[PDB]
């Protein structure tokens, strides 16, 4: 019946990636909205698109991990 799945273009993957590594990865919703508008998606949509595009840059530049272990 009802899915509620769309699926990005080039033009969203062209400009959200422009706002990633030339401005910020933690934007606040102030710099968000623009995002949003500029190519055409919302803040709720811009969000997930930074966190999980996180998820890959973490691995890319290196970060520690949060795990408290007895032996590590």
């Not at 509620?4 to 990636?17: N, R």
Request: charged letters at 30%; one cysteine or more.
């Amino acid at each position: 019946g009802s899915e509620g799945a769309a699926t990005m273009t080039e033009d969203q993957v062209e400009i959200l990636e422009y706002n990633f590594n030339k401005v910020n990865k933690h934007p606040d919703p102030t710099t968000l909205c623009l995002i949003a508008a500029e190519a055409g998606l919302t803040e709720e949509q811009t969000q997930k698109w930074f966190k999980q595009r996180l998820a890959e840059w973490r691995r890319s530049e290196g970060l520690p991990s949060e795990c408290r272990s007895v032996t590590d």
